[PDB]
Design a protein around this ligand. Sequence first.
Ligand SMILES: *[C@@H]1O[C@H](CO)[C@@H](O[C@@H]2O[C@H](CO)[C@@H](O)[C@H](O)[C@H]2NC(C)=O)[C@H](O)[C@H]1NC(C)=O
Ligand SMILES: *[C@@H]1O[C@H](CO)[C@@H](O[C@@H]2O[C@H](CO)[C@@H](O)[C@H](O)[C@H]2NC(C)=O)[C@H](O)[C@H]1NC(C)=O
Ligand SMILES: *[C@@H]1O[C@H](CO)[C@@H](O[C@@H]2O[C@H](CO)[C@@H](O)[C@H](O)[C@H]2NC(C)=O)[C@H](O)[C@H]1NC(C)=O
Ligand SMILES: *[C@@H]1O[C@H](CO)[C@@H](O[C@@H]2O[C@H](CO)[C@@H](O)[C@H](O)[C@H]2NC(C)=O)[C@H](O)[C@H]1NC(C)=O
Ligand SMILES: *[C@@H]1O[C@H](CO)[C@@H](O)[C@H](O)[C@H]1NC(C)=O
Ligand SMILES: *[C@@H]1O[C@H](CO)[C@@H](O)[C@H](O)[C@H]1NC(C)=O
Ligand SMILES: *[C@@H]1O[C@H](CO)[C@@H](O)[C@H](O)[C@H]1NC(C)=O
Ligand SMILES: *[C@@H]1O[C@H](CO)[C@@H](O)[C@H](O)[C@H]1NC(C)=O
Ligand SMILES: *[C@@H]1O[C@H](CO)[C@@H](O)[C@H](O)[C@H]1NC(C)=O
Ligand SMILES: *[C@@H]1O[C@H](CO)[C@@H](O)[C@H](O)[C@H]1NC(C)=O
Ligand SMILES: *[C@@H]1O[C@H](CO)[C@@H](O)[C@H](O)[C@H]1NC(C)=O
Lengths: 216, 478, 270, 50, 35, 49
Amino acid sequence: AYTNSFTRGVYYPDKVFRSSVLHSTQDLFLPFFSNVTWFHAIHDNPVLPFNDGVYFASTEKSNIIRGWIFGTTLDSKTQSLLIVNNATNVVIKVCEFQFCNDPFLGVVYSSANNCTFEYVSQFKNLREFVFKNIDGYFKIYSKHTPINLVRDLPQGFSALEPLVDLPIGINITRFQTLLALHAYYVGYLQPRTFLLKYNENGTITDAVDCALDPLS
Amino acid sequence: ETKCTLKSFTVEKGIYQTSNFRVQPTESIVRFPNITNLCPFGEVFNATRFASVYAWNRKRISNCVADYSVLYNSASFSTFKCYGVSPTKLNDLCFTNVYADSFVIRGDEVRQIAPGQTGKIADYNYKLPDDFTGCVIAWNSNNLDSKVGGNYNYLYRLFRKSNLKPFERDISTEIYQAGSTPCNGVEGFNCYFPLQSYGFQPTNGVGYQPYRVVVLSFELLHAPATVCGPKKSTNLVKNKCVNFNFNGLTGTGVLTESNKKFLPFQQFGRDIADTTDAVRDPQTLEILDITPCSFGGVSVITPGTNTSNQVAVLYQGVNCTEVPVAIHADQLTPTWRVYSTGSNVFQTRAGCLIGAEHVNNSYECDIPIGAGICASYQSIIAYTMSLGAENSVAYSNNSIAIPTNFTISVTTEILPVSMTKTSVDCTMYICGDSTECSNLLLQYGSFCTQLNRALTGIAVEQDKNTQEVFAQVKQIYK
Amino acid sequence: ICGDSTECSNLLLQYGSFCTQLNRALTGIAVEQDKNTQEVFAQVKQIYKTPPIKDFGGFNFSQILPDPSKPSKRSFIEDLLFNKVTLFNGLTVLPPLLTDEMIAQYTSALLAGTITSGWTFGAGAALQIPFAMQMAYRFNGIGVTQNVLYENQKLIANQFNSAIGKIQDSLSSTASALGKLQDVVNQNAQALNTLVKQLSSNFGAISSVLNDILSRLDPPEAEVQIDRLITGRLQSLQTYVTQQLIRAAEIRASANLAATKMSECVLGQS
Amino acid sequence: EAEVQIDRLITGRLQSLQTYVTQQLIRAAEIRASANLAATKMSECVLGQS
Amino acid sequence: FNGLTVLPPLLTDEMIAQYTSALLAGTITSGWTFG
Amino acid sequence: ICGDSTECSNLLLQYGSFCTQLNRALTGIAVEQDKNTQEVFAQVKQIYK
Ligand SMILES: *[C@@H]1O[C@H](CO)[C@@H](O[C@@H]2O[C@H](CO)[C@@H](O)[C@H](O)[C@H]2NC(C)=O)[C@H](O)[C@H]1NC(C)=O
Ligand SMILES: *[C@@H]1O[C@H](CO)[C@@H](O[C@@H]2O[C@H](CO)[C@@H](O)[C@H](O)[C@H]2NC(C)=O)[C@H](O)[C@H]1NC(C)=O
Ligand SMILES: *[C@@H]1O[C@H](CO)[C@@H](O[C@@H]2O[C@H](CO)[C@@H](O)[C@H](O)[C@H]2NC(C)=O)[C@H](O)[C@H]1NC(C)=O
Ligand SMILES: *[C@@H]1O[C@H](CO)[C@@H](O[C@@H]2O[C@H](CO)[C@@H](O)[C@H](O)[C@H]2NC(C)=O)[C@H](O)[C@H]1NC(C)=O
Ligand SMILES: *[C@@H]1O[C@H](CO)[C@@H](O)[C@H](O)[C@H]1NC(C)=O
Ligand SMILES: *[C@@H]1O[C@H](CO)[C@@H](O)[C@H](O)[C@H]1NC(C)=O
Ligand SMILES: *[C@@H]1O[C@H](CO)[C@@H](O)[C@H](O)[C@H]1NC(C)=O
Ligand SMILES: *[C@@H]1O[C@H](CO)[C@@H](O)[C@H](O)[C@H]1NC(C)=O
Ligand SMILES: *[C@@H]1O[C@H](CO)[C@@H](O)[C@H](O)[C@H]1NC(C)=O
Ligand SMILES: *[C@@H]1O[C@H](CO)[C@@H](O)[C@H](O)[C@H]1NC(C)=O
Ligand SMILES: *[C@@H]1O[C@H](CO)[C@@H](O)[C@H](O)[C@H]1NC(C)=O
C-alpha cells in the first residue's frame, strides 16, 4: 500500500536557540509529498532494512505496538538492541539475544550472554518517531500530541524535539516491530537540504524544501 | 605617540589616530554541573577475596568517572610506580576502556610484573605484552592472608615449556604425564601436578608474605571515550569582563540578566553568525546574557606643535563608567593621569573627550569631532557646531528692494590635471639579477606583461589628458 | 585576525607594514564622505526664517514648510520619506559629523530663501520680492509673456495645490519608488555580513579557532596552520577594502552630480 | 629549500605589487575625472560667458 | 632607483606658458570670437 | 578551476564562499549594461514616421 505524506518529518536539528531568522540546513530529512508504505497488519511483521534511519507513526491509542528491536543478525553472535515499553517505564537492553520466531509482548527472552549495557527511563493520539544512528550515537525523537481538527491521514505541521541519545557504538542494518498475541506507517529518509523559519519563541513555524521545485 | 605614528618631529593642527585600547579581562570562572557518575572502584581494591595467580579474575569497567588523585595520596600502598603513565596527570586523561587484573602473589614475585622480564609467573601464569600497559599496584595483606588465609587456598602453576601468550588464561587442570618415550622411556611415571601450594607462615619474612596485586591496563584511541576523570569548579561573577569555560564551551565578555525564554530541553542560544548570546547553567537553570567587552581606538586632538604643546584625548564609543578602566589608573606614567580622570570628562554622542572643558556658547570651529560637536583652541574648548549668522527678511505683500551700487570681485580656483608618469621594472624588483629567480618566475604565467601594460597605459593616458586640457587654440597670438 | 593571541602577533609582525594602508584608505574614504555631504548641503552663508504671517498670492506651502509641532523641526514630506525606507568583531561604525537637525535647518533655510527672495539670495544679499512678481519673472524667461500670469492667477494656484496634494498622496502610496537608497543600504549591510561570516572558514587548516589547534598541537606545524589562516584572512580583508574603494568612487560621482543639480536648479532657473 | 624560500619571496612581493598597481589605477581614474571637469570649465567659462 | 623610474613629461613648462599667454591675449583682444 | 572533478570541488568548498561574490560582481555589471543603453535611447514615448 502507498500513502502520500504531505509535510511530516521536520525536527529541530540542533540545540541552539534562534529567533526570527531563516536558517538553511543540510541534514537527513524526509522529502515533502513522499510515499510511505502503509501497513494494515490486522487479522504481519516483515523484515524492514534500516537504511540509515526510518520515519515512523501510529494511530492506535492503546498498547499493541510495544517494542522496536534493532540489530544486524538477530542472533547471539552479535549484540542486538531491544527497546520496549512497560506502560510506566522504557527499558533498553543491548545485550546478545537469540532469534525469535513470533515474539509476543504486552502489559521472547532467549538468552543474555555477553551482557554489557542497560538503560531505564520513564480521533486518537499520534506518536511520530524518528530514529537516527551516526558515529556510535543512536538518538530518538518523539511527539505524543495530535491535532483534533481533521480525521484520516497525517496532515498538519508540527516540530519534533529529541528525547534520548545513547552512545552504543554498534552497527544496525535491520529492525523488527514486536506485537502481542491474540496501522503503522514506514518511510525512508535521505540527506536533502531544507530551509527553516524560527519564531520569536524558538519554535519552528515553517519549513521549505530546497531541491523540489524551481519556485522552492 | 602622535609623533611616533607620524614619524615626524612637527605635528600640524588637527585630529590624529594613534592606537586602540581594550578592556583587560580580570579573572576566570570554571563551571561544571552538579552530577558526577561515581564508579565503584572500592569493591576492586577492598574486595573480600581475590583469586589465585594462575586463575585471576577479570571484570569489565566502563562509563565511569573516578579520580586518580584520591588514591595517589593514600599511604596504604607499598609503592606506586607506573610505566609511562603519569600519576598526577591521570586526572586529565580519557580512556576507551580499562581492564583490571586482581590476584595475590609472594613477596619476591612483585618485580616479575614488568614487560620483557623472566620469571615463573611472568612467563607461565600472566605475561605482560611487549607494549604499553597502565601499571601494577601492590600492597601488603598479611592481616587477612598470612594469618587467617587458607594454607593451600593459594596455588601457583609450576608448568614449564608452555610460555603463555599475553592475556591468556588456562584454568584446565590436567596431569602432566607425557605418555611417550621422552620421559624415562616409560609411560605413567614422571607425573607432576601442575599446581603447587604456597609455603607461608605468620611473619616469616619479606619474600614470602602474600601481597595483593592489581594490574590496570588502559586502551587509548581504540573507541569513543567512556571513562574520564572529574575536575574542580567554582562560583560565578557578574558584571565584569571575564573569560570562562562556562558549562564546557568557552567565551569572554560581561554577564547580565536576561528576560528571554528557553525551551525545557535547549542548551543555549545565539543570534547571528555563530555569536553566542545566551547560556544557562545546570546549577541554576537560569538564562543569562553575554556582551562583548568594550574596546576601540583612541584619538588625539592638537592645535599644532608650533603654537602650543597641549592636546586633548578622545575615546570612541566608550561610556563614562569605563573611562578609568579604559586606561589603567596605576600602570602608565603620571603624566597620563592629567588626561585620565578629573580634568573634564565631556561624555558626548561619539564617546568621551577628556582634557578639554565644556562651554555652552557656540562659534564656528575648525577641528571636527562629530555628532555635531567640535573642539578648538582659543586652553582647548569643545562646543556645538554653529550654522552661521541669523537674520529674517521682512517679506511683505507690496515691497521690493532694488540695489543701487555694485562691486567687482576676483576669486581663485585651483584644479589638478596630471600626476607623475612613473614606472616600475617588471622582474628587477623581485629578482635583482638572479637566474634562479627568473627560472622560478617563468612558472607563474604572464603576470609580468600584465603588470607592465597597465603602467604604460596610465602614462599614455596622462599625456593625452594634459594635451586635451591645455591645447585648444590652433595659433599663437602675441 | 589574531583575536588577542601573542604568537599570532609574533607571526604577523614579520609580514611588513600593511596595516598602515589598510587603515589610511578607510580614513581617506571617510573624510571624503564627510566633505562630500558638507559640500552638497552647506551652500548658504546665513539662516533665513519665514515670516509668521503668510500670504503667498494664493499658493499653499503648508505641507512643504517645516511645522513647529513636529519633533525634529521637519515637514510632512520629510517624515514620510524617513518612515518609508528602513534598514561587532573589530568592526566599528563612526557617527556622521552632521546629524539630521542641521540638515533640516539647511533645507528649511534654502526653502525660505527661495520662496521669499527668489534667486538673488544665491548671488549676494537677499532681497524681498512678492511671490506673484517672482512667478511673472520666471514665466518671462520661458517665452510666455507676463500678461498671461496676471490674468490666470487663481487657475494656476488651484492647479499647483492639486498637483502638490496628488504628488504627496502618490509618494505615500507608491511602492519601491525609493529603490536606490534601499539598494545602497542593502549592499553595505551585505558586504559587512559577508566579511564577518568569513571567520568560520577552515581555509585548509585543522579548525577555524586558533586556541584549539594551538592547544592540540606543537609549534612546528602549528605555525604552518597559523600562517595559512593569516594569509586567507589577508586576502579576504584586501578584497573587502577594494570593493569599498570602488563603491566610494561611485557614490562620489553621484554626489557631485547631485551638488551640481542643486546649485544650478534650486538657486536659479535652468 | 632555496626554491621554497624563493617561492615565498615571490609570492609576497607579487601580492604587494598587485596592491600598488590597483591603487595607482584607482587614483589615475579619479584624476582623469577631475581633469575632465577642469577641461570643461576652461572651455566654457573662459572662451565665453557662463 | 632600484628598479623604479620616473619618466619625464612630454610637454615642458615653456609650452604651457606659451599656451596660457596665447589664450589670455586672445581673450583680451578678441573676446569670444576667437573661439 | 575544477574541470569537472570531485576532489577539486571538495577542496574548494572548505575555502568559504569566494565564488558566491565572484559570481555576483559580474552579474551586477551585466544587469547595469542593459539600463545603460536603455536610458540613453528610450527618450521618447511614441514612434513617429
Ligand atoms: C511565546 O511566548 C510568550 C511568552 O509567555 C507567550 O505568551 C504571550 O506573550 C505575549 C507578550 O506579552 C502576549 O501578548 C500574549 O498574549 C501571550 N500569550 C499567551 C497565550 O499568554 C506566547 O503565547 C508564546 N507564543 C506566541 C505565538 O507568542
Ligand atoms: C553610562 O552608564 C550609565 C549607568 O549604567 C547610564 O545611566 C543610565 O542609563 C540608563 C539607560 O541605559 C537609564 O535608564 C538610567 O536612568 C541611567 N542612570 C542610572 C542607571 O543611574 C548612561 O546612560 C550610560 N551612558 C551611555 C552614553 O550609554
Ligand atoms: C558706490 O561705491 C563706491 C565705492 O564703494 C563709491 O565711490 C566712492 O565715492 C566716494 C565719494 O565720492 C569717494 O570718496 C571714494 O573714493 C569712492 N570710492 C572709490 C573706490 O572710488 C560710489 O560713490 C558709490 N556710489 C554712489 C552712487 O555713491
Ligand atoms: C493648505 O493645506 C492644508 C492641508 O492640505 C490646509 O489645512 C487644513 O486646515 C483646516 C483647518 O484646521 C483643516 O480642517 C483641514 O483638515 C486641513 N487640511 C487637510 C487636508 O487636513 C490649509 O487650510 C490649506 N491652506 C490654504 C490657504 O489653502
Ligand atoms: C508517489 O507519490 C506520488 C505523489 O503523491 C503519487 O502520484 C504516486 O502514485 C506515488 N507512487 C509512485 C510509485 O510514484
Ligand atoms: C561481546 O560482544 C561484543 C560485540 O559483539 C564483542 O566485541 C565481545 O568480544 C563480546 N565479548 C565480550 C566479553 O565483550
Ligand atoms: C512494569 O510496570 C508494572 C506496574 O504497572 C511494574 O510492577 C513492573 O515492575 C514494571 N516492569 C519493569 C520491568 O519495571
Ligand atoms: C558496520 O558493520 C561492519 C560489518 O560489516 C563493521 O565492520 C563496522 O564496524 C560497523 N560499523 C559501525 C559503526 O560499527
Ligand atoms: C546540584 O544540582 C542541582 C540541580 O539543579 C543544582 O541546583 C545545585 O546547585 C547543585 N548543587 C551543587 C552543590 O552543585
Ligand atoms: C606658528 O605660530 C605662530 C603663532 O600662532 C604664527 O604666527 C606662525 O605663522 C606659525 N608658523 C608656522 C610655520 O606654522
Ligand atoms: C548651559 O548654559 C547654562 C546657563 O544657564 C549653564 O548653567 C550650563 O552649565 C551650560 N551647560 C554646559 C556648559 O554644559
